[PDB]
Structure 1
Amino acid sequence: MIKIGAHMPISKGFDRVPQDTVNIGGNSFQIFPHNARSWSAKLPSDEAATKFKREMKKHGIDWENAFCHSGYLINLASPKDDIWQKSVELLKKEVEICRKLGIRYLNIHPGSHLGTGEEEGIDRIVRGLNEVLNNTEGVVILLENVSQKGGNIGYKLEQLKKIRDLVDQRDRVAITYDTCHGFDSGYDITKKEGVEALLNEIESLFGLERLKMIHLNDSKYPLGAAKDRHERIGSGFIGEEGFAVFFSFKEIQEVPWILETPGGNEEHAEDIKKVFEIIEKFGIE
């Protein structure tokens, strides 16, 4: 029923990810596309990509439940042309990594304008997305909501809509909702009226079909804190009671839930168990 997993390490190879996912009790995952520390990234070898696909098949992982997260360096809103250009080129490479692996989705944070203006930053993001999308095929870019820190763009869903609606290939732009980033920004999923408002907002701005992933993160801080410090499920200010409200909506259950909570595979296995404990304890249908 539930589509759930975690951000998984790739350091031992992409092909380990399907088994590792099953081993933590998941049926979905997110991975980085590389471990580059600068502006160039290698492709997986032919052998590595084939082995990954083989393991995906062996473990029966639904390809609609497998996601890449773009690297930490890319910033399509940067007012520094160096950074903008290098970001565009690395994002193209990340799309090609996804395409080689068969991954259908590449999730990005829109960017930060570093205090040079939301409108101008949105236009730079759009320009960058057009350069990437118009020179690649297949892969859909997911825009993730973020916290309101520095010059970040995307702390309100309206900002994601402004970007998406300007991109040429808007069918290749969809949305990821991160519960911690959202909670930081005033999206109060701890009350049913807050979840209803969130869903109404998604439906109006994008259509619900565009919600492709939820990043399921508790928060170390209260509603509105703008801190971006994730917490283990049930251990933060969203809490067991808040997640029970969020989980109760069928619209939410339809979308994969990907943990980005503190820790590694073992903590994530515990968090998946906690999610099911919450569903059971609160009698969620």
Structure 2
Amino acid sequence: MIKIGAHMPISKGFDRVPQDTVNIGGNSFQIFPHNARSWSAKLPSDEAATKFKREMKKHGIDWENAFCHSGYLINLASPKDDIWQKSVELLKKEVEICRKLGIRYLNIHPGSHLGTGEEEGIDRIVRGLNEVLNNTEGVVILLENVSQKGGNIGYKLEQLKKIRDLVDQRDRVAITYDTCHGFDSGYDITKKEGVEALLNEIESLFGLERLKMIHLNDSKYPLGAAKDRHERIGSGFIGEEGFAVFFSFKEIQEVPWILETPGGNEEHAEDIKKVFEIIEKFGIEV
């Protein structure tokens, strides 16, 4: 069964999210844990967490299909110690928001060394994840591949493995694959040989059960462009044919597809329709 959804707004409450998710034709979703402007975030009230949980039950959303995503402030690779410390403290709080909501997965970008060096930046990330994981329980942190922009770490799957193998609680570190960031970095899912190489690399670096989520994004730019600009499904350089190849892999189907393409609920309902249209047109099983 296809597990698909989108990044959902939380601005009207967490509890609106399950209903909004089924209204766009999804059964999966991603949300931010908060809308804080700075380094401090509130927890949801007991009242709000309870409503969220009730709506999850009401709509039969699978808890393996519900993800949180960290905000853009957190940078565990920062060469500024105070930003590193505030990032750690905020990440811990985001794990506590997840715990409160019942959310099992917290997705993050590993970070940027800002031109101080990839190897030292990886160590900083590792140490930061240790401080976080060693002071929390339950929640699994997802490392997401990113584009090769400035001092971003994680544009090659190899880098995500370097972080993971140094972490204390490796079972609480897993992986998210973003189709747009990968395409930006040369991972060519428009060809079955590219998808096969991607899967072989994932299986060998992490094992396939570490792949917890795919971010389903088309790209504004060509393969290898390193641009980090998402596009609506079928409207970019991955395209309808490219996605049809990607969708044809059973291994890919086992994993929730989360849209982070431009627009709101309305555009995402259309992108979800496009995905089923692509699957129908190209005769993909299932």
Please confirm whether the aligned pair reaches a TM-score higher than 0.5, indicating the same fold. Answer: yes
Structure 2 SS opposite 1:177: strand
- Distance in 1, matches of 2:33 and 2:272, equals 23
Structure 1 SS opposite 2:68: strand
Structure 1 SS opposite 2:195: helix
- Give the CA deviation at 1:217: 0.1
- Distance in 2, matches of 1:8 and 1:43, equals 18
- Give the CA deviation at 1:89: 0.1
- Distance in 1, matches of 2:283 and 2:16, equals 35
- Give the CA deviation at 1:264: 0.3
- Distance in 2, matches of 1:71 and 1:84, equals 14
- Distance in 2, matches of 1:5 and 1:124, equals 33
CA offsets, 1:222-252, max 9 Å, x none? 0000000000000000000000000000000
What's the RMSD between the two structures over aligned residues?
0.2
CA offsets, 1:147-201, max 9 Å, x none? 0000000000000000000000000000000000000000000000000000000
> What does residue 153 of structure 1 align with?
153
Q: 4+ residue stretches of structure 1 with deviation over 3 A?
A: none
> 1:12-23 residue pairs with structure 2 within 5 A?
12-23=12-23
TM-score normalised by L of structure 1: 1.00
- Distance in 1, matches of 2:129 and 2:13, equals 28
- Give the CA deviation at 1:123: 0.2
- Distance in 2, matches of 1:61 and 1:247, equals 22
Structure 2 SS opposite 1:227: coil
- Give the CA deviation at 1:208: 0.2
Q: How many residues align?
A: 285
> What does residue 218 of structure 2 align with?
218
CA offsets, 1:80-128, max 9 Å, x none? 0010000000000000000000000000000000011111000000000
- Give the CA deviation at 1:206: 0.1
> What does residue 4 of structure 2 align with?
4
TM-score normalised by L of structure 2: 1.00
> What does residue 168 of structure 2 align with?
168
Gaps of 5+ in 1: none
Structure 1 SS opposite 2:71: coil
Gaps of 5+ in 2: none
> What does residue 245 of structure 1 align with?
245
Structure 2 SS opposite 1:159: helix
- Distance in 2, matches of 1:117 and 1:221, equals 27
